[PDB]
């Protein structure tokens, strides 16, 4: 919120050069000056026979906004033979990626083409150049004896580059190995020391590079974007690269170890063609010292209010934790086709809040495709997802979109104001803009009113112009100003005081200042540092009792401060801005003395009562807990009476009951501060004697861990009176109950089997299902529905194994879905396998019992048992009374034996169900 948008620094390169396609800071160690590095990959060069070779310019921040190109190559290409160009610098896009660490700078030409050394060709291997002050070396890892599309010939290395804290270059390229992509890393000192101008393919020691993979990974575009950060125990930055065409175009982000190229972690997009991994970034946003991952998906499509698909873009935020398991949150774009996740730039800590902040840009968003950049402050909870400021680039469109964004670099203080600044490049207009942060002054103000209770008949101080006695009081207000970074020694505030702000709106003015004779007064103030609060003493009187109708309405003294901005010597001008969330004013109320008794002081008797209403609230559900409160004042009037409802932990406020006539519509607010969450409700200002109120308060209780027994609420009435200003503390609790509705269901497929059975031949020694009979399958489901969950339970199955020594339903194999183990008292498949109505239950037949152990079925989940059996055809017909209706009845019982919540009274859950398979005759 502290970026200054009124007067930034605008740098412009030649048109058509894509000036601003890449930006970074140049902070040399040999100079106290700093510079802006801007890439212009389509710029023309003095290089002989080279058209649009591209270049990188050094822009001076001091004055004149003048930019000068940094000279890397300045030469022609090369020769393999008489007329056989050994390389092609034309349209090589040199400067498409620019990165700088300390005095080292690295620029690359991803479209540089080679021809190699074997056969005539043009292969976009790409190349880079590393220069330190004087010496310039060429760096082209993908230019090697591994050629064509199978090798590194099409790699276009230098597409994305980055530096580590160990001065190791991380360089990716999408085209290696039929566009699988590749990451190549080398020591900076090794690059320069090993450089031989007479050797085109240079072998570097201690090079970390990914190898080719299976062709399934082709066209992944690994190395499209890269970033650095450490995600393991070591201090050495580890490699992070987005690979947008990976995972059947879903998009992925690969993380590799900094020690060796071994893979560490993976991310995957949830939507195809969204280009998940188009841009990546690494910062710690929660200040927990663990770097956290940011992944851009500018083509991602969310769904609007009507549910239609629309492309707003999406950015993935993954917080690294102690164990290493990321906690990932997503945020979406705002304008359609704006491509929100196009560029993700860490800007450091912009506000100096102690937590780093980040910037995300939508280059084709804003007003008529002008571009827009959103910045987001981080905090302890992680990255807070709402723009604290919006950067809207204003530039016309000549040929292509003036992409504002698509190139950003932050986390560097160029003005030396103690605050990091931000560069946003726009290659559509061939321009780059530098925004400067502001000092962020945090002002602490306070207001105290003297004898806040006014006695109408106490006329002590009066000097209103040949004085006559009048009732008086003093207004004292103090002002503290402090900040971080560079900022002037003293600040100038403009304070405005308003008396009885509630009135004066088509109403009588009830209080005036003594000397001013006015309801309002203003004064110019000056503070220097924190804890230096400077106050002023003003005397405001109260008009005569007969001049107005008086009121029970309190007199609200309203202080407002301005802080006109004159600051930041030279450097155009830089206006410090106040804190993000800060009061622009404060109020305090005074009351006229009325009905306080002969003691001339109001001493209320406050008492708060509460009824249980619902006695029980169940564990896993969200419950409509309503508390009826009885607020009584049996004493004298209590000023600024408020009902304080302390809701701990899982409890969150819903609202107040408007539907009930017997209950009050009193306005309540949910307030969290000083590590205390609670509900405040106005009982009246003042709350008059004999006042009794009834109002309900709805909440929703989920849980905190487990086995908390009951939940406790705290109710107290408090007021601003000098004595007896509070009620007692009345706490009310409601017991948590365990209720989990568990049902057991079963089906048989088929429900019936019609005898005789097609193609049935009895075999003396059965071999397959064809030799036994059809397939009867019983499915039993044990499902937990109720809010609570059970930790362990038992399941009993009774199967009609045999009737009179011959098999009824021959069980082959049973499977289990969910958390359940099962055991059969009789061996399944003793013979193995390849692959009126008379009721037959396990009671009247031989029983094959299956006992299963079940555990940990939560609210949603359930447990299943699939029993696949063959009907034994050989048993039927015969002396089995061929024509008779048989129903095969299998029973299943369940019993819940344990619960995860202890110290809570529990009740056993048991129920049974039966599954029948009816075998009958269609012809008699």
């Amino acid at each position: 919120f502290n970026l200054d948008v009124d007067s930034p620094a605008e740098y412009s390169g030649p048109e058509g050069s894509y000036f601003g396609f890449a930006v970074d800071f140049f902070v040399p160690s040999a100079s106290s000056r700093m510079f802006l590095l801007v890439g212009a990959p389509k710029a023309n060069t003095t290089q002989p026979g080279i058209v649009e070779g591209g270049q990188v310019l050094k822009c001076d921040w001091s004055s004149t906004r003048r930019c000068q190109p940094i000279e890397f190559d300045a030469t022609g290409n090369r020769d393999y033979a008489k007329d056989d160009p050994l390389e092609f610098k034309s349209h090589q896009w040199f400067g498409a990626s620019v990165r700088s660490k300390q005095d080292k700078i690295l620029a690359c030409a991803p479209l540089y083409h080679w021809r190699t050394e074997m056969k005539q060709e043009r292969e976009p291997v790409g190349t880079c150049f590393l220069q330190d002050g004087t010496k310039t070396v060429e760096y082209a890892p993908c230019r090697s004896q591994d050629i064509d599309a199978d090798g590194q010939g099409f790699c276009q290395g230098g597409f994305s580059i980055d530096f580590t804290k160990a001065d190791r270059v991380l360089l990716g390229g999408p085209g290696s190995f039929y566009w699988q992509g590749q990451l190549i890393s080398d020591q900076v000192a090794e690059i320069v020391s090993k450089y031989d101008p007479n050797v085109y393919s240079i072998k570097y020691n201690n090079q970390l590079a990914t190898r080719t993979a299976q062709a399934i990974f082709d066209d992944s575009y690994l190395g499209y974007s890269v970033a650095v950060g450490d995600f393991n125990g070591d201090g050495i930055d580890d490699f992070v690269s987005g690979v947008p065409r990976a995972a059947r175009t879903l998009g992925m982000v690969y993380i590799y170890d900094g020690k060796n190229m071994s893979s560490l972690y993976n991310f995957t997009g949830e939507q195809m063609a969204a280009y998940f991994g188009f841009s990546v970034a690494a910062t710690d946003i929660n200040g927990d010292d663990y770097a956290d991952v940011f992944i851009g998906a500018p083509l991602f499509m969310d769904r609007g209010s009507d549910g239609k698909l629309q492309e707003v873009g999406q950015v993935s935020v993954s917080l690294q934790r102690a164990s290493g398991d990321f906690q990932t949150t997503k945020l979406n774009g705002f304008e359609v086709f704006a491509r929100f996740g196009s560029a993700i730039a860490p800007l450091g800590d912009l506000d100096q809040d102690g937590f780093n902040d980040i910037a995300i840009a939508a280059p084709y968003g804003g007003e008529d495709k002008k571009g827009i950049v959103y910045i987001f402050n981080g905090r302890s909870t992680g990255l807070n997802a709402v723009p604290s400021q919006i950067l809207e680039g204003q530039w016309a469109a000549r040929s292509m979109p003036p992409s504002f964004g698509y190139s950003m670099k932050g986390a560097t203080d160029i003005d030396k104001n103690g605050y990091p600044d931000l560069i946003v490049g726009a290659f559509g207009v061939d321009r780059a803009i530098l925004y400067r942060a502001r000092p962020v002054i945090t002002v602490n103000a306070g207001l105290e009113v003297y004898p806040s209770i006014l006695n109408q008949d106490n006329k002590t101080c009066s000097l209103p112009g040949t004085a006559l006695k009048v009732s008086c009081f003093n207004v004292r207000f103090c002002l503290k100003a402090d900040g971080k970074g560079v900022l002037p020694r003293k600040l100038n505030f403009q304070v405005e005081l308003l008396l009885d702000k509630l009135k004066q709106k088509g109403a009588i003015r009830r209080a005036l200042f003594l000397y001013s004779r006015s309801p309002s007064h203003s004064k110019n103030m000056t503070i220097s540092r924190g804890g230096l609060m400077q106050c002023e003493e003003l005397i405001a009187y109260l008009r005569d009792e007969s001049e107005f109708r008086d009121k029970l309405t309190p007199i609200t003294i309203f202080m407002e401060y301005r802080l006109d901005y004159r600051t930041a010597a030279d450097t155009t001008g830089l206006q410090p801005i106040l804190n993000q969330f800060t009061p622009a004013n404060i109020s305090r109320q005074a009351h006229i003395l009325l009905d306080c008794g002969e003691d001339n002081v109001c001493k209320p008797k406050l008492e708060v009562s509460v009824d249980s209403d619902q006695k029980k609230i169940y564990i896993g559900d969200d419950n409509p807990l309503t508390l009826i409160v009885k607020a009584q004042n049996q004493g004298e009037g209590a000023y600024e009476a408020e009902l304080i409802v302390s809701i701990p932990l899982q409890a969150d406020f819903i609202g107040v009951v408007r539907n009930n006539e017997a209950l009050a519509r009193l306005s309540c607010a949910f307030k969290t501060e000083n590590q205390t969450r609670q509900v405040v409700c106005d009982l009246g200002n003042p709350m008059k004697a004999g006042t009794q109120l009834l109002a309900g308060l709805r909440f929703s209780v989920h849980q905190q861990s487990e086995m908390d027994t009951s939940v406790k609420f705290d109710l107290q009435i408090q007021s601003s009176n000098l004595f007896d200003k509070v009620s007692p503390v009345v706490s009310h609790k409601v017991d948590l109950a365990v209720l989990a509705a568990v049902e057991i269901r079963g089906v048989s497929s088929p429900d019936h089997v019609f005898l005789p059975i097609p193609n049935w031949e009895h075999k003396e020694n059965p071999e397959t299902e064809e030799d036994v009979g059809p397939v009867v399958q019983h499915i039993y489901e044990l499902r937990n529905n109720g809010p609570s969950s059970f930790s362990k339970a038992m399941l009993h199955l009774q199967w009609p194994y045999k009737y009179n020594n011959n098999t009824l339903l021959y069980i082959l194999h049973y499977d289990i879905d969910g958390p359940m183990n099962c055991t059969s008292d009789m061996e399944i498949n003793p013979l193995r396998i390849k692959i009126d109505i008379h009721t037959l239950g396990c009671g009247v037949a031989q029983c094959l019992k299956i006992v299963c152990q079940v555990g940990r079925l939560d609210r949603g989940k359930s447990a299943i048992l699939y029993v696949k059996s063959l009907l034994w055809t050989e048993t039927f017909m015969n002396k089995e009374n061929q024509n008779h209706s048989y129903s095969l009845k299998s029973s299943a019982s369940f019993n819940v034996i344990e619960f995860p919540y202890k110290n809570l009274p529990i009740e056993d859950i048991t129920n049974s169900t039966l599954v029948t398979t009816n075998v009958t005759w269609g012809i008699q």
């Binding site: 896009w93 991803p110 479209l111 083409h113 005539q120 060709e121 043009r122 976009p124 599309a149 099409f154 276009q156 597409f159 085209g175 566009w179 066209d219 499209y224 065409r245 059947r248 175009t249 195809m272 063609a273 280009y275 083509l299 499509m301 769904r303 209010s305 009507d306 549910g307 698909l309 629309q310 492309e311 086709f337 292509m400 979109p401 992409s403 290659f427 509630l502 009135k503 709106k505 088509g506 109403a507 009588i508 309405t553 819903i654 609202g655 306005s667 949910f670 079963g746 089906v747 497929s749 088929p750 429900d751 019936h752 097609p758 039993y780 489901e781 949603g860 299943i864 269609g922 012809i923």
Partner: protein
């Protein structure tokens, strides 16, 4: 007695028109005072007060143009009408709603335009057998559904730039095949070949001439061709009032947007027509591949249906791609089974098997509700689409239009149309907000009393600080001079606390974080009901402690959603037919059914138990599915009676049951072979003897 109108809108005329749509207003200053002027309905008719001066705007929805629905797609019809009505005039007073209805019909013999996009890259030389015949065979199976259809085609390879193309020794520029000891054609972007015409001979002759080219990048980027064939109307020749089919064929995967950055292409696809008279994509080198969203947007604007006909290996890819572009189907290209012949007609059947309404240019201030009547007055609510349809069927939609306030507009318009059709319903929107006699006011001062005052139609109210029945208020305030019943009963304190009651009209602003209004100032406009950390869940405004939810949101807390999309299952039926959709989440109502889409049903009737009802329906004409006339609509599964033969067996479910005639019917059904509901019923079931 006292009502909502007499408690809020007594301040003015226009402010009285916006309290509730039931409120009214009284002009005709004869016999003033004695009653509120903002009362409603016949309460102002109780008092005489009934000249033309009475103000009671009534929201109207009137049909301007309604032509009858057409029957056949010939040229002797009206013009052609698949939507009744066509133009509707809508007049709305603030915070009021009126509802209307619309019929949509798929008409028989509707002309069909088919444009072919063919991949000519080297990977397609093996699959080039499908281009042969085509126009001759394309017509034959299309003759059943549509006479007077027109065909045409164009080709694409890839972007003729950096790595995609061969910049290798110059003989590979003219002949990209120098390696492999063969000769092929030079590559190109999208290339228009044959505009839509009548002659199939002109088609087959020009089709056989096509040969294959070569590029080295595996994704071919046919999306470039899709974008151009959609946005170029004249070059392609897309007709109007005809079905637009764009069929896409490729051997392998495709480029998506942002892929062109490797080629040095940073310019996003503008979605314009860059095809010149030379029938080439001029911007193929200069601008990137079109994104799915831009393809989706432009596809529906031109009412063009996209069809994916791809190789079996890459089918699941484009099948997954098609889910992101609703209204597009995918089919398998193979030398066995159905192939091109019955493929396209099935794809065209799928497109015409669904009817969904799309809304263009809908103003922000009003929202639309949809109950869908698809099958014989089933009045399914909350849904703007009907599935499971055949050509010749007609569906109905009831639509409610409710506006929140009115932004003092003259006229707006929005279009409701079925997706993929030219026929549309245009709704003209006009808002009645200002009183008719408001313009009669003569603006200058002294019109009411003592000069320096305000006025309106049947209204006098003095200015700030003056604020009286004619002109007087506090800064004298006398005695209260009445309680003015600032409360509904005199046994209650001053009006809604909040700055007490002054000089009759209760003045209570207090300026605190919002605006406070009312006759007694009972309307806070800021204090409201909150669901989770936000007021009205951030999806609605707050008026007098009540939430007015934004479009596509309902409920007291405004946390309920109109969307049925997240309630849709894999089969396309909401909640898998096992439940009902409420607030965007399915509530399953069936024994043993659960899941987000209610797709999980481990314990419930399986296979035949559902389908044995359909065979009695279709084959035996026996009821319980034939009673509600849901036979042809519900189960479209084709039933072919087989003679005595249950085959050697594949993945299948063999199912038997006994009918009303006590005969055992045996049948079975195959699972998906390219997908189908095919069902075989054995003729001559088993019955008793005699």
């Amino acid at each position: 007695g006292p009502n909502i109108c007499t408690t809020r809108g007594v301040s003015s005329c226009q402010q009285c028109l916006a309290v509730s749509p039931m409120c009214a207003w009284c002009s005709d200053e004869a016999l003033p005072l004695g009653s509120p002027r903002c009362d409603l309905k016949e309460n102002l008719l109780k008092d005489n007060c009934a000249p033309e001066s009475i103000e009671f705007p009534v929201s109207e929805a009137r049909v301007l143009e309604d032509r009858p629905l057409s029957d056949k797609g010939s040229g002797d019809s009206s013009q052609v009408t698949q939507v009744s009505p066509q133009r509707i005039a809508l007049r709305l007073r603030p915070d009021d709603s009126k509802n209307f209805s619309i019929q949509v019909r798929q008409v028989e013999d509707y002309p069909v335009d088919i444009y072919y996009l063919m991949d000519l890259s080297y990977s397609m030389k093996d699959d080039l057998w499908s281009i042969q015949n085509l126009g001759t065979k394309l017509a034959t199976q299309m003759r059943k559904l549509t006479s007077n259809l027109r065909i045409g085609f164009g080709a694409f390879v890839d972007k003729p730039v950096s790595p995609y193309m061969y910049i290798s020794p110059p003989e590979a520029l003219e002949n990209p095949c120098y390696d492999m000891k063969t000769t092929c054609l030079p590559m190109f972007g999208y290339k228009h070949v044959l505009t839509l015409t009548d002659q199939v001979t002109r088609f087959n002759e020009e089709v056989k001439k096509q040969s294959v080219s070569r590029n080295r990048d595996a994704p071919e980027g046919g999306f470039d061709a899709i974008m151009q064939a959609t946005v170029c109307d004249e070059k392609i020749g897309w007709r109007n009032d005809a079905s637009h089919l764009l069929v896409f064929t490729t051997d392998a995967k495709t480029h998506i947007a942002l892929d062109g950055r490797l080629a040095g292409i940073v310019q996003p696809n503008d979605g314009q027509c860059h095809v010149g008279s030379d029938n080439h994509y001029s911007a193929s080198t200069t601008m990137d591949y079109p994104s799915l969203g831009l393809m989706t947007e432009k596809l529906s604007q031109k009412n063009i249906n996209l069809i994916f006909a791809v190789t079996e290996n890459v089918v699941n890819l484009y099948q997954n791609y098609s889910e992101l572009i609703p209204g597009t189907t995918v089919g398998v290209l193979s030398m066995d089974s159905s192939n091109v012949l019955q493929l396209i007609v099935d794809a065209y059947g799928k497109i015409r098997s669904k009817v969904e309404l799309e809304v263009r240019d809908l103003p922000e201030e009003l929202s639309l509700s949809f109950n869908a009547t698809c099958l014989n007055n089933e009045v399914i609510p909350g849904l703007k689409s009907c599935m499971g349809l055949k050509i010749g069927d007609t569906v109905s939609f009831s639509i409610e239009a409710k506006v929140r306030g009115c932004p003092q507009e003259k006229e707006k318009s929005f279009t409701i149309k079925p997706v993929g059709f030219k026929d549309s319903l245009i709704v003209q929107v006009t808002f009645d907000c200002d009183c008719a006699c408001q313009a009669q006011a003569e603006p200058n001062s002294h019109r009411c009393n003592n000069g320096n005052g305000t006025f309106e139609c049947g209204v006098c109210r003095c200015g700030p600080g003056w604020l009286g029945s004619q002109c007087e208020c506090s800064e004298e305030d006398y005695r209260p001079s009445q309680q003015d019943e600032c409360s509904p009963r005199e046994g209650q304190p001053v009006c809604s606390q909040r700055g007490e009651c002054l000089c009759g009209q209760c003045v209570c602003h207090s300026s605190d974080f919002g605006k406070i209004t009312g006759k007694y100032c009972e309307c806070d406009d800021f204090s409201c009901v909150r669901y989770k950390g936000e007021m009205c869940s951030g999806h609605g405004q707050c008026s007098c402690g009540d939430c007015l939810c934004d479009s596509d949101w309902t409920g007291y807390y405004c946390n309920c959603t109109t969307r049925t999309d997240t309630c849709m299952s894999s089969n396309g039926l909401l909640c898998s037919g096992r439940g009902k959709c409420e607030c965007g989440s399915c509530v399953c109502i069936q024994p043993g059914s659960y899941g987000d889409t209610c797709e999980k049903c481990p314990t419930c009737p399986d296979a035949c138990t559902f389908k044995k009802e359909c065979v009695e329906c279709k084959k035996f004409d026996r009821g319980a599915l034939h009673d509600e006339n849901t036979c042809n609509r519900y189960c479209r599964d084709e039933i072919e009676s087989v003679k005595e033969l249950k085959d050697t067996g594949k993945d299948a479910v063999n199912c038997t049951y006994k009918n009303e005639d006590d005969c055992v019917v045996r049948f079975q059904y195959y699972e998906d072979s390219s997908g189908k509901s095919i069902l075989y019923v054995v003729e001559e079931p088993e019955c008793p003897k005699g």
